[PDB]
Design a protein around this ligand. Structure first.
Ligand SMILES: CN1CCN(c2ccccc2C/N=N\C(N)=S)CC1
Ligand SMILES: CN1CCN(c2ccccc2C/N=N\C(N)=S)CC1
Ligand SMILES: C[As](C)(=O)[O-]
Ligand SMILES: C[As](C)(=O)[O-]
Ligand SMILES: [Ca+2]
Ligand SMILES: [Ca+2]
Ligand SMILES: [Ca+2]
Ligand SMILES: [Ca+2]
Lengths: 88, 88
């Protein structure tokens, strides 16, 4: 189904970026940026400034370890989905 | 992108079922059941007993109004995605 395809897409895209550098199960600043710029180009403005990268990570980093884990990525997805939902 | 397609799939499948009966922005017991049975047939066991329907709603119903709204649906999706993530 389309729902099951959406579940596996969330897992795959996270790992496409998290496993690039350092901890393979977390997104660092540069990995989060590329994910937003390449995969969310219709929902979000392209990030071109360092302070936007820093602010976005600050917002998503719930436990405060400097990176975005899978749970925090899921919360980010929930935010975008809710913002898009309320648009209509 | 695949991620953006996943975001719109979550919104669409929720409304496919929530808008069937009663409140068009919330899932009642029978609507939640059909969503699980039709759209999550590879991730979850088919619900065939009433007490399984009742228990699942009890688990998902965070604010305690008897139904599953969009925020609660997103938390449900997060649960399944995390369970599938940890499987590998
Ligand atoms: C600069 N933009 C271009 C992408 N946009 C957008 C694009 C398509 C459909 C809906 C939205 C609307 N709204 N919100 C989100 N995507 S979070 C708006 C922001
Ligand atoms: C009775 N089942 C059939 C569907 N399953 C399943 C199917 C495919 C890939 C991974 C899982 C594994 N694990 N978890 C979830 N889907 S939440 C297991 C449960
Ligand atoms: C850790 As690699 C070689 O997939 O960027
Ligand atoms: C409320 As209807 C007619 O789409 O089931
Ligand atoms: Ca990483
Ligand atoms: Ca973190
Ligand atoms: Ca309803
Ligand atoms: Ca509720």
């Amino acid at each position: 189904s389309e729902l099951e395809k959406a579940v596996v897409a969330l897992i795959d895209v996270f790992h496409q970026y998290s496993g690039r550098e350092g901890d393979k199960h977390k997104l660092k600043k540069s990995e989060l940026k590329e994910l937003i710029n390449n995969e969310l180009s219709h929902f979000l403005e392209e990030i071109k400034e360092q302070e936007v990268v820093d602010k976005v990570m600050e917002t998503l980093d719930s436990d405060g370890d400097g990176e975005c884990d899978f749970q925090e990525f899921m919360a980010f997805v929930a935010m975008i989905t809710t913002a898009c939902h309320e648009f209509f």
